[PDB]
mmCIF file of C-alpha atoms and ligand atoms in Angstrom:
data_model
loop_
_atom_site.group_PDB
_atom_site.id
_atom_site.type_symbol
_atom_site.label_atom_id
_atom_site.label_comp_id
_atom_site.label_asym_id
_atom_site.label_seq_id
_atom_site.Cartn_x
_atom_site.Cartn_y
_atom_site.Cartn_z
ATOM 1 C CA UNK A 1 122.497 94.264 121.258
ATOM 2 C CA UNK A 2 122.501 93.732 117.437
ATOM 3 C CA UNK A 3 122.232 96.239 114.685
ATOM 4 C CA UNK A 4 123.364 97.570 111.556
ATOM 5 C CA UNK A 5 126.325 99.608 112.595
ATOM 6 C CA UNK A 6 129.978 99.006 112.011
ATOM 7 C CA UNK A 7 130.010 97.669 115.673
ATOM 8 C CA UNK A 8 127.252 95.430 115.900
ATOM 9 C CA UNK A 9 126.188 94.867 112.087
ATOM 10 C CA UNK A 10 125.825 91.725 110.194
ATOM 11 C CA UNK A 11 129.714 90.988 110.749
ATOM 12 C CA UNK A 12 129.177 90.482 114.024
ATOM 13 C CA UNK A 13 126.006 88.682 114.399
ATOM 14 C CA UNK A 14 127.446 85.093 114.270
ATOM 15 C CA UNK A 15 129.058 85.662 117.796
ATOM 16 C CA UNK A 16 125.807 85.714 119.185
ATOM 17 C CA UNK A 17 123.855 83.670 116.610
ATOM 18 C CA UNK A 18 126.135 81.314 115.241
ATOM 19 C CA UNK A 19 123.106 80.073 112.824
ATOM 20 C CA UNK A 20 124.256 82.844 111.129
ATOM 21 C CA UNK A 21 126.826 80.826 109.400
ATOM 22 C CA UNK A 22 124.721 78.128 108.628
ATOM 23 C CA UNK A 23 123.589 76.096 105.356
ATOM 24 C CA UNK A 24 119.940 78.194 104.646
ATOM 25 C CA UNK A 25 120.726 81.660 105.399
ATOM 26 C CA UNK A 26 119.045 84.551 104.070
ATOM 27 C CA UNK A 27 119.002 86.709 101.922
ATOM 28 C CA UNK A 28 120.671 85.838 98.855
ATOM 29 C CA UNK A 29 121.569 86.894 95.145
ATOM 30 C CA UNK A 30 118.794 85.335 92.688
ATOM 31 C CA UNK A 31 120.774 84.379 89.678
ATOM 32 C CA UNK A 32 118.237 84.727 87.020
ATOM 33 C CA UNK A 33 119.422 82.603 84.387
ATOM 34 C CA UNK A 34 120.406 79.660 87.188
ATOM 35 C CA UNK A 35 116.626 79.926 88.783
ATOM 36 C CA UNK A 36 114.617 77.082 87.365
ATOM 37 C CA UNK A 37 110.851 77.159 86.383
ATOM 38 C CA UNK A 38 109.101 74.623 88.472
ATOM 39 C CA UNK A 39 106.338 72.987 87.085
ATOM 40 C CA UNK A 40 105.280 71.559 90.267
ATOM 41 C CA UNK A 41 104.493 75.127 91.759
ATOM 42 C CA UNK A 42 100.824 75.495 92.469
ATOM 43 C CA UNK A 43 99.157 79.234 92.120
ATOM 44 C CA UNK A 44 100.125 81.258 94.610
ATOM 45 C CA UNK A 45 97.041 82.470 96.407
ATOM 46 C CA UNK A 46 97.082 86.084 98.232
ATOM 47 C CA UNK A 47 94.093 86.564 100.163
ATOM 48 C CA UNK A 48 94.253 89.791 102.192
ATOM 49 C CA UNK A 49 90.581 90.922 101.763
ATOM 50 C CA UNK A 50 89.740 90.574 105.380
ATOM 51 C CA UNK A 51 93.123 91.606 106.982
ATOM 52 C CA UNK A 52 93.151 93.393 110.108
ATOM 53 C CA UNK A 53 95.689 95.888 110.655
ATOM 54 C CA UNK A 54 96.077 97.044 114.378
ATOM 55 C CA UNK A 55 99.299 98.983 115.125
ATOM 56 C CA UNK A 56 102.364 100.383 113.838
ATOM 57 C CA UNK A 57 105.736 99.911 116.091
ATOM 58 C CA UNK A 58 109.309 101.282 115.581
ATOM 59 C CA UNK A 59 111.290 98.634 117.279
ATOM 60 C CA UNK A 60 114.543 100.126 116.913
ATOM 61 C CA UNK A 61 115.454 98.053 113.507
ATOM 62 C CA UNK A 62 112.604 98.656 110.848
ATOM 63 C CA UNK A 63 108.919 99.683 111.571
ATOM 64 C CA UNK A 64 106.302 96.570 111.586
ATOM 65 C CA UNK A 65 102.734 97.142 110.743
ATOM 66 C CA UNK A 66 101.101 94.475 112.867
ATOM 67 C CA UNK A 67 97.659 92.703 111.917
ATOM 68 C CA UNK A 68 95.630 90.182 113.949
ATOM 69 C CA UNK A 69 96.343 87.009 113.270
ATOM 70 C CA UNK A 70 93.974 85.072 116.108
ATOM 71 C CA UNK A 71 91.780 83.754 112.974
ATOM 72 C CA UNK A 72 92.425 83.055 109.542
ATOM 73 C CA UNK A 73 91.572 86.845 108.010
ATOM 74 C CA UNK A 74 94.956 87.390 105.701
ATOM 75 C CA UNK A 75 96.551 84.340 104.471
ATOM 76 C CA UNK A 76 99.265 82.934 102.051
ATOM 77 C CA UNK A 77 98.548 79.750 100.242
ATOM 78 C CA UNK A 78 99.587 77.755 97.204
ATOM 79 C CA UNK A 79 102.900 78.004 95.246
ATOM 80 C CA UNK A 80 105.521 75.905 97.199
ATOM 81 C CA UNK A 81 103.717 76.114 100.366
ATOM 82 C CA UNK A 82 101.779 73.098 101.947
ATOM 83 C CA UNK A 83 98.822 74.599 103.920
ATOM 84 C CA UNK A 84 97.945 77.940 105.105
ATOM 85 C CA UNK A 85 100.060 80.714 106.359
ATOM 86 C CA UNK A 86 98.725 83.485 108.546
ATOM 87 C CA UNK A 87 99.770 87.097 107.854
ATOM 88 C CA UNK A 88 101.297 88.560 111.102
ATOM 89 C CA UNK A 89 103.309 91.683 110.083
ATOM 90 C CA UNK A 90 105.089 93.338 107.382
ATOM 91 C CA UNK A 91 107.904 95.489 107.427
ATOM 92 C CA UNK A 92 110.673 97.343 105.202
ATOM 93 C CA UNK A 93 114.221 97.167 104.896
ATOM 94 C CA UNK A 94 115.999 100.529 102.990
ATOM 95 C CA UNK A 95 118.885 102.150 102.111
ATOM 96 C CA UNK A 96 120.906 105.796 102.752
ATOM 97 C CA UNK A 97 120.639 105.867 99.015
ATOM 98 C CA UNK A 98 118.552 104.822 96.047
ATOM 99 C CA UNK A 99 121.199 102.361 94.948
ATOM 100 C CA UNK A 100 121.079 100.023 97.772
ATOM 101 C CA UNK A 101 118.514 98.983 100.547
ATOM 102 C CA UNK A 102 116.960 95.622 99.490
ATOM 103 C CA UNK A 103 117.985 91.992 101.206
ATOM 104 C CA UNK A 104 117.749 90.117 98.241
ATOM 105 C CA UNK A 105 119.186 91.036 94.813
ATOM 106 C CA UNK A 106 118.509 90.295 91.388
ATOM 107 C CA UNK A 107 121.837 89.361 88.854
ATOM 108 C CA UNK A 108 123.621 91.484 92.036
ATOM 109 C CA UNK A 109 121.101 94.582 91.383
ATOM 110 C CA UNK A 110 119.957 96.062 94.628
ATOM 111 C CA UNK A 111 116.664 97.556 94.946
ATOM 112 C CA UNK A 112 116.067 100.812 96.973
ATOM 113 C CA UNK A 113 114.268 99.020 99.544
ATOM 114 C CA UNK A 114 112.203 95.542 99.951
ATOM 115 C CA UNK A 115 108.853 95.158 101.797
ATOM 116 C CA UNK A 116 108.590 91.521 103.972
ATOM 117 C CA UNK A 117 104.822 90.198 104.461
ATOM 118 C CA UNK A 118 105.511 87.752 107.122
ATOM 119 C CA UNK A 119 103.491 84.727 107.874
ATOM 120 C CA UNK A 120 103.199 81.809 109.891
ATOM 121 C CA UNK A 121 102.145 78.294 109.220
ATOM 122 C CA UNK A 122 98.933 77.453 111.136
ATOM 123 C CA UNK A 123 99.470 74.012 111.825
ATOM 124 C CA UNK A 124 102.139 75.018 114.591
ATOM 125 C CA UNK A 125 99.180 77.105 116.241
ATOM 126 C CA UNK A 126 101.262 80.417 116.914
ATOM 127 C CA UNK A 127 104.308 82.364 115.727
ATOM 128 C CA UNK A 128 106.474 81.061 118.480
ATOM 129 C CA UNK A 129 106.140 77.422 117.606
ATOM 130 C CA UNK A 130 106.264 77.934 114.085
ATOM 131 C CA UNK A 131 109.946 79.449 114.352
ATOM 132 C CA UNK A 132 110.975 76.296 115.624
ATOM 133 C CA UNK A 133 110.171 74.360 112.543
ATOM 134 C CA UNK A 134 111.671 74.182 108.966
ATOM 135 C CA UNK A 135 108.502 75.003 107.274
ATOM 136 C CA UNK A 136 107.361 77.482 110.058
ATOM 137 C CA UNK A 137 107.351 80.871 108.430
ATOM 138 C CA UNK A 138 106.181 82.324 104.661
ATOM 139 C CA UNK A 139 107.738 85.600 103.679
ATOM 140 C CA UNK A 140 106.630 87.521 100.684
ATOM 141 C CA UNK A 141 109.437 89.786 99.361
ATOM 142 C CA UNK A 142 108.375 92.486 97.253
ATOM 143 C CA UNK A 143 111.099 94.873 95.795
ATOM 144 C CA UNK A 144 111.043 99.133 95.739
ATOM 145 C CA UNK A 145 112.124 101.030 93.187
ATOM 146 C CA UNK A 146 112.089 105.049 93.071
ATOM 147 C CA UNK A 147 109.821 106.511 90.631
ATOM 148 C CA UNK A 148 105.902 106.871 90.637
ATOM 149 C CA UNK A 149 104.469 107.275 93.977
ATOM 150 C CA UNK A 150 102.660 104.021 95.290
ATOM 151 C CA UNK A 151 99.127 105.400 96.566
ATOM 152 C CA UNK A 152 98.664 102.479 98.893
ATOM 153 C CA UNK A 153 101.661 103.495 100.737
ATOM 154 C CA UNK A 154 101.279 106.769 101.532
ATOM 155 C CA UNK A 155 99.129 105.985 104.766
ATOM 156 C CA UNK A 156 102.041 104.296 105.931
ATOM 157 C CA UNK A 157 104.397 107.354 105.451
ATOM 158 C CA UNK A 158 102.460 109.332 106.825
ATOM 159 C CA UNK A 159 102.123 108.245 110.261
ATOM 160 C CA UNK A 160 105.981 107.603 110.542
ATOM 161 C CA UNK A 161 106.305 111.113 112.277
ATOM 162 C CA UNK A 162 104.589 110.040 115.134
ATOM 163 C CA UNK A 163 107.106 106.750 115.607
ATOM 164 C CA UNK A 164 110.301 108.402 114.947
ATOM 165 C CA UNK A 165 112.213 106.736 118.204
ATOM 166 C CA UNK A 166 112.273 103.144 119.111
ATOM 167 C CA UNK A 167 109.623 101.703 121.247
ATOM 168 C CA UNK A 168 106.863 104.558 119.732
ATOM 169 C CA UNK A 169 103.897 102.788 118.458
ATOM 170 C CA UNK A 170 100.409 104.349 117.072
ATOM 171 C CA UNK A 171 97.193 102.970 116.229
ATOM 172 C CA UNK A 172 97.293 101.442 112.360
ATOM 173 C CA UNK A 173 93.644 100.037 111.711
ATOM 174 C CA UNK A 174 91.812 99.427 108.580
ATOM 175 C CA UNK A 175 94.953 99.507 106.467
ATOM 176 C CA UNK A 176 94.891 97.631 103.463
ATOM 177 C CA UNK A 177 98.189 95.706 102.496
ATOM 178 C CA UNK A 178 96.792 94.843 99.121
ATOM 179 C CA UNK A 179 97.617 98.367 98.169
ATOM 180 C CA UNK A 180 101.130 97.119 98.217
ATOM 181 C CA UNK A 181 101.387 94.526 95.816
ATOM 182 C CA UNK A 182 102.226 95.028 92.077
ATOM 183 C CA UNK A 183 100.486 93.749 89.073
ATOM 184 C CA UNK A 184 101.768 90.332 88.520
ATOM 185 C CA UNK A 185 102.536 87.532 91.109
ATOM 186 C CA UNK A 186 105.690 85.784 89.154
ATOM 187 C CA UNK A 187 107.928 84.774 91.627
ATOM 188 C CA UNK A 188 111.213 83.385 92.748
ATOM 189 C CA UNK A 189 111.113 80.462 95.831
ATOM 190 C CA UNK A 190 113.852 79.098 98.021
ATOM 191 C CA UNK A 191 114.157 77.952 101.611
ATOM 192 C CA UNK A 192 115.702 80.149 103.730
ATOM 193 C CA UNK A 193 115.658 82.042 107.292
ATOM 194 C CA UNK A 194 115.055 85.270 109.086
ATOM 195 C CA UNK A 195 117.152 88.275 107.907
ATOM 196 C CA UNK A 196 117.788 89.579 111.036
ATOM 197 C CA UNK A 197 118.783 87.770 114.492
ATOM 198 C CA UNK A 198 117.712 84.980 115.566
ATOM 199 C CA UNK A 199 118.490 84.399 112.189
ATOM 200 C CA UNK A 200 116.274 81.024 112.235
ATOM 201 C CA UNK A 201 116.121 78.644 109.347
ATOM 202 C CA UNK A 202 112.664 78.522 109.157
ATOM 203 C CA UNK A 203 111.334 80.326 106.164
ATOM 204 C CA UNK A 204 110.193 79.482 102.575
ATOM 205 C CA UNK A 205 110.759 82.773 100.735
ATOM 206 C CA UNK A 206 108.890 84.050 97.699
ATOM 207 C CA UNK A 207 110.459 87.078 96.159
ATOM 208 C CA UNK A 208 108.002 88.716 93.270
ATOM 209 C CA UNK A 209 109.756 89.590 90.206
ATOM 210 C CA UNK A 210 107.813 92.663 89.693
ATOM 211 C CA UNK A 211 109.095 95.440 91.892
ATOM 212 C CA UNK A 212 106.628 98.206 93.355
ATOM 213 C CA UNK A 213 107.265 101.859 92.253
ATOM 214 C CA UNK A 214 107.426 104.645 95.133
ATOM 215 C CA UNK A 215 108.324 108.086 95.004
ATOM 216 C CA UNK A 216 111.114 109.874 96.205
ATOM 217 C CA UNK A 217 109.163 111.772 98.906
ATOM 218 C CA UNK A 218 107.775 108.575 99.953
ATOM 219 C CA UNK A 219 111.591 106.710 100.869
ATOM 220 C CA UNK A 220 112.834 109.777 101.938
ATOM 221 C CA UNK A 221 110.493 109.811 104.844
ATOM 222 C CA UNK A 222 111.565 106.206 106.066
ATOM 223 C CA UNK A 223 115.115 107.855 106.215
ATOM 224 C CA UNK A 224 113.731 110.378 108.676
ATOM 225 C CA UNK A 225 112.770 107.529 111.267
ATOM 226 C CA UNK A 226 115.420 106.728 114.145
ATOM 227 C CA UNK A 227 117.185 103.745 115.455
ATOM 228 C CA UNK A 228 117.540 105.516 118.542
ATOM 229 C CA UNK A 229 115.134 106.032 121.300
ATOM 230 C CA UNK A 230 113.613 109.644 122.670
ATOM 231 C CA UNK A 231 115.738 111.598 124.534
ATOM 232 C CA UNK A 232 119.062 109.879 122.820
ATOM 233 C CA UNK A 233 121.378 110.842 119.939
ATOM 234 C CA UNK A 234 119.753 110.803 116.632
ATOM 235 C CA UNK A 235 120.863 107.822 114.478
ATOM 236 C CA UNK A 236 119.073 107.646 111.130
ATOM 237 C CA UNK A 237 117.314 104.610 110.753
ATOM 238 C CA UNK A 238 118.869 103.767 107.501
ATOM 239 C CA UNK A 239 120.724 100.815 105.475
ATOM 240 C CA UNK A 240 118.802 98.078 108.040
ATOM 241 C CA UNK A 241 120.020 95.359 105.311
ATOM 242 C CA UNK A 242 121.685 92.124 105.644
ATOM 243 C CA UNK A 243 123.945 91.460 102.493
ATOM 244 C CA UNK A 244 123.677 88.164 100.400
ATOM 245 C CA UNK A 245 124.731 85.308 101.979
ATOM 246 C CA UNK A 246 125.980 81.966 100.549
ATOM 247 C CA UNK A 247 123.283 79.891 98.598
ATOM 248 C CA UNK A 248 125.247 76.811 99.445
ATOM 249 C CA UNK A 249 123.317 73.453 99.249
ATOM 250 C CA UNK A 250 119.814 75.475 97.327
ATOM 251 C CA UNK A 251 118.164 75.827 94.119
ATOM 252 C CA UNK A 252 115.871 78.952 93.467
ATOM 253 C CA UNK A 253 112.824 77.822 91.444
ATOM 254 C CA UNK A 254 110.644 80.268 89.563
ATOM 255 C CA UNK A 255 106.924 79.969 89.094
ATOM 256 C CA UNK A 256 107.389 81.718 85.326
ATOM 257 C CA UNK A 257 108.635 80.221 82.331
HETATM 258 C C1 4JC B 301 93.386 98.078 98.048
HETATM 259 C C2 4JC B 301 94.002 97.969 96.869
HETATM 260 C C3 4JC B 301 93.610 96.754 96.076
HETATM 261 C C4 4JC B 301 93.775 96.990 94.662
HETATM 262 C C5 4JC B 301 93.341 95.928 93.821
HETATM 263 C C6 4JC B 301 92.366 95.025 94.296
HETATM 264 S S1 4JC B 301 91.577 93.764 93.061
HETATM 265 N N1 4JC B 301 92.660 92.522 93.377
HETATM 266 O O1 4JC B 301 91.174 94.056 91.718
HETATM 267 O O2 4JC B 301 90.517 93.365 94.157
HETATM 268 C C7 4JC B 301 91.850 95.061 95.603
HETATM 269 C C8 4JC B 301 92.521 96.116 96.271
HETATM 270 C C1 4JC B 302 111.277 87.089 114.603
HETATM 271 C C2 4JC B 302 110.821 88.640 113.728
HETATM 272 C C3 4JC B 302 111.289 88.669 112.338
HETATM 273 C C4 4JC B 302 110.412 88.245 111.325
HETATM 274 C C5 4JC B 302 110.567 88.491 110.083
HETATM 275 C C6 4JC B 302 112.260 88.822 109.483
HETATM 276 S S1 4JC B 302 112.613 88.874 107.860
HETATM 277 N N1 4JC B 302 113.293 90.207 107.763
HETATM 278 O O1 4JC B 302 111.281 89.005 107.396
HETATM 279 O O2 4JC B 302 113.013 87.783 107.741
HETATM 280 C C7 4JC B 302 112.966 88.670 110.657
HETATM 281 C C8 4JC B 302 112.815 89.018 111.972
HETATM 282 ZN ZN1 ZN B 303 112.405 91.864 106.634
#
């Protein structure tokens, strides 16, 4: 199956997932000079006060913090979005070194990592139906740079030892994802896709301009995770990012002047 190695990585994905060469693939480079302020964008609303985290899972590609999405507990609305999008999970992509790891780039700059908060459009009833729609998902993307520690990330960092290998999970209740946000909600937005197989073109991307800072020690612990299962030869979970894809017939809009 697919992965991030030389023999199963992004250059190979198109053979089983032909949409990999599609018209609205993600991630993309964000050319800041070409992006245009869009006065039609409504204020962005991140409403995570009632978020109910459940579990953290190493899925062999990254780790997911999963949420109870059986009700409108944690939602994203406004901005480019019509209606209500419910938080289902977050995860990260990161590098083997601080100079790489993000999926989106900004004027070709790579960040050390990128956080994806994944939401589905409630008008479609469930996540599975949402990923059959052109406006099924909204992903809030946040860049990570290495500097001062992010206090709201430490609980995640500290549980990673318990989910080292593929298929391991742990209880992860009472985690507040608000602690992962930067101060500013200024963003860029464009229509795109999932950045891993099946690469479905269902996503409205909302990428925050302001990165969060995490410490070297925090990201080093991400890099101790394993792609492999227990008892198998160790393959460090690093460089689990897809590079930028052709922009094609798209415009990136900015929320800020
Ligand atoms: C838990 C982190 C956090 C940080 C700031 C806020 S707020 N927007 O100031 O109420 C809430 C929660
Ligand atoms: C279907 C699972 C899934 C959910 C989110 C992503 S991503 N990396 O946020 O585009 C990829 C895959
Ligand atoms: Zn992702």
